[PDB]
Amino acid sequence: QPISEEEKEGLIEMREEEKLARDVYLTLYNKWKLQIFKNIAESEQTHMDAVKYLLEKYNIPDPVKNDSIGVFSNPKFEELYKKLVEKGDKSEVDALKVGATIEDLDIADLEKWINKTDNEDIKFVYENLMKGSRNHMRAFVRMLNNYGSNYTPQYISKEEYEEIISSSTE
Amino acid sequence: QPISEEEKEGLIEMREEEKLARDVYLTLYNKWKLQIFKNIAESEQTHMDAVKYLLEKYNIPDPVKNDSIGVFSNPKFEELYKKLVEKGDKSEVDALKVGATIEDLDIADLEKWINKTDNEDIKFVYENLMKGSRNHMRAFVRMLNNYGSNYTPQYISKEEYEEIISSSTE
Numbered sequence: 088q089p090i091s092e093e094e095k096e097g098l099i100e101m102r103e104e105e106k107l108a109r110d111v112y113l114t115l116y117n118k119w120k121l122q123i124f125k126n127i128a129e130s131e132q133t134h135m136d137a138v139k140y141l142l143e144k145y146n147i148p149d150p151v152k153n154d155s156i157g158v159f160s161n162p163k164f165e166e167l168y169k170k171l172v173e174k175g176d177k178s179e180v181d182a183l184k185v186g187a188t189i190e191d192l193d194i195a196d197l198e199k200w201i202n203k204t205d206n207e208d209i210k211f212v213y214e215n216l217m218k219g220s221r222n223h224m225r226a227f228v229r230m231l232n233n234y235g236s237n238y239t240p241q242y243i244s245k246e247e248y249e250e251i252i253s254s255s256t257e
Numbered sequence: 258q259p260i261s262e263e264e265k266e267g268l269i270e271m272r273e274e275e276k277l278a279r280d281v282y283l284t285l286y287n288k289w290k291l292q293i294f295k296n297i298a299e300s301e302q303t304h305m306d307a308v309k310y311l312l313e314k315y316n317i318p319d320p321v322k323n324d325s326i327g328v329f330s331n332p333k334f335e336e337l338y339k340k341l342v343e344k345g346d347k348s349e350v351d352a353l354k355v356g357a358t359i360e361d362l363d364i365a366d367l368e369k370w371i372n373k374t375d376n377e378d379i380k381f382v383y384e385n386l387m388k389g390s391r392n393h394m395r396a397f398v399r400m401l402n403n404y405g406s407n408y409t410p411q412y413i414s415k416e417e418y419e420e421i422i423s424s425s426t427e
């Protein structure tokens with residue numbers, strides 16, 4: 088029941104991964120003004136706060152030294168932020184696909200970390216986060232459907248992607 | 258008294274230059290929490306709005322399609338935003354020097370554009386903006402002085418820099 092360095096590394100990654108979702112969705116909201124990005128950004132702020140509560144619980148240094156949109160300590164996220172906002176700027180459909188894409192990445196990463204921890208505190212937050220992301224994914228894809236488009240998964244398997252989109256809400 | 262294409266190009270540049278100041282100062286405020294960046298960011302929002310009123314007056318397409326921090330249509334500003342936030346992240350003194358630096362650039366550019374226009378509407382906004390920037394410059398440099406530092410001008414001349422800092426407020 089003490090936390091391991093590995094479990095700390097997971098929380099540090101997820102704290103900024105939820106920020107990546109929040110910041111890309113804010114940025115795309117300011118561009119396209121589709122309410123889904125505003126709504127889900129707020130949910131990502133909730134998710135960020137959930138990770139932060141665990142960071143504080145274990146007195147782990149918060150990787151978010153600057154809450155400004157686009158700012159990250161781990162450059163994998165700074166890179167993804169730049170990549171994804173450039174793709175999302177092209178059209179409403181490209182922005183919705185970027186939404187699905189971030190949810191796809193986040194679900195895959197949440198599974199990765201869930202599987203490395205036996206910690207009831209941590210597992211619980213991750214499960215809740217994953218339930219959230221599956222709902223975000225369903226929301227983005229349904230919106231892509233309204234535009235006569237769809238989504239091809241990149242990080243999660245085809246099979247898990249189909250199980251997410253063929254079900255209702257959690 | 259009609260506006261020229263050249264005068265339009267000036268307003269389009271300044272609209273995003275004031276955004277550059279605003280966004281860098283927001284970003285540095287979120288990092289360092291020095292009240293000067295919050296205070297002056299608000300002034301830059303006022304300046305942004307002043308340019309926007311002229312853009313609307315002449316129905317010039319606003320270059321700001323996305324108000325999110327860090328987002329620019331003219332890449333000279335996207336580049337300066339990245340350069341300057343990286344420099345400002347290093348220390349409080351480096352952030353204050355970045356403040357002075359943006360004010361320096363903005364004053365030089367405002368002089369450039371002021372000198373290309375006979376338009377009373379435009380000249381007036383630019384003069385007001387310049388009075389603002391000179392006040393921001395004095396505020397940043399005084400803060401650098403509190404940290405035992407100072408500022409070397411990059412864009413304006415030494416002589417105009419000395420005339421700004423040796424005077425009181427406008």
Ligand SMILES: [Zn+2]
Pocket residue numbers: 105108130131134193216219220
């Ligand atoms: Zn999330």
Ligand SMILES: [Zn+2]
Pocket residue numbers: 108127131190193219220223
């Ligand atoms: Zn999400």
Ligand SMILES: [Zn+2]
Pocket residue numbers: 275278300301304363386389390
């Ligand atoms: Zn200004």
Ligand SMILES: [Zn+2]
Pocket residue numbers: 278297301360363389390393
């Ligand atoms: Zn200024």
